[PDB]
Amino acid sequence: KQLRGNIYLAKVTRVEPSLQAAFIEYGGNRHGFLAFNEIHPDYYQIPVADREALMRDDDVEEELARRKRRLMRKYKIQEVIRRRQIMLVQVVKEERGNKGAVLTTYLSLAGRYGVLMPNTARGGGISRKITAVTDRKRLKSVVQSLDVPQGMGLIVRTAGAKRTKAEIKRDYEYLLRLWENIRENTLHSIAPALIYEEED
Structure with missing residues (x-):
C-alpha cells in the first residue's frame, strides 16, 4: 500500500x-x-x-x-x-x-489535465513542459478565464496541452467539488482519519 x-x-x-x-x-x-x-x-x-x-x-x-x-x-x-x-x-x-x-x-489534487492547489496562492498556470508557444499562449488564456480563487492555484499538466477548450474547465470544476468534499469530510471526522485517498 x-x-x-x-x-x-x-x-x-x-x-x-x-x-x-x-x-x-x-x-x-x-x-x-x-x-x-x-x-x-x-x-x-x-x-x-x-x-x-x-x-x-x-x-x-x-x-x-x-x-x-x-x-x-x-x-x-x-x-x-x-x-x-x-x-x-x-x-x-x-x-x-x-x-x-x-x-x-x-495540498494538491490532481485531475486529468491539471493539478488543483486549494492551499497555495499561486493563481494557476502551466506545466514546465510549457514549450510549444501555440499551446502556452492559448492555455495561459484558458487558465486566465478560470477565475481561480483567492489563495488557490491550478497547474495545467502536459495531458492538457493538446486539450479541449472546455475539457479543462470541466476537470477544474471537478477538482473544486472534490476540494469541497474533502473539507466537508473533515468536519465529520476525528483525529487520525483518512480523508482522501489518492485514487490512481
Whole structure:
C-alpha cells in the first residue's frame, strides 16, 4: 500500500524546535514528519489580524519562495504550533522502514489535465513542459478565464496541452467539488482519519 497523495486529518504529537518540525499522528505505523515551512499559516496560533497581515503578501514562483522565507525568518515553530493541534496533511514521501512519512499541509489534487492547489496562492498556470508557444499562449488564456480563487492555484499538466477548450474547465470544476468534499469530510471526522485517498 503506497500512501503518497493521501490526505489525513491528523494531530501534532510533538513540536521539535531543533529541527523546526512537528511530528504527526495520522494513522500510519510511525509519526509523519512536518517541516515548519510546509505548514500553511492558517494553522499558526496567532491573532486573526496577524494572519491577515501575512496572507496578503505583507518564474513568479519566486514571489511564493520569498513569501515562505518571510515566515521562516519571522516565527519559530514552537511560537505558533502546539502539541495536539489538528491539521490536514498530505503524504509527500512514503514511510521507508523505520523512517516515517514526509508530509505537507500545502495540498494538491490532481485531475486529468491539471493539478488543483486549494492551499497555495499561486493563481494557476502551466506545466514546465510549457514549450510549444501555440499551446502556452492559448492555455495561459484558458487558465486566465478560470477565475481561480483567492489563495488557490491550478497547474495545467502536459495531458492538457493538446486539450479541449472546455475539457479543462470541466476537470477544474471537478477538482473544486472534490476540494469541497474533502473539507466537508473533515468536519465529520476525528483525529487520525483518512480523508482522501489518492485514487490512481
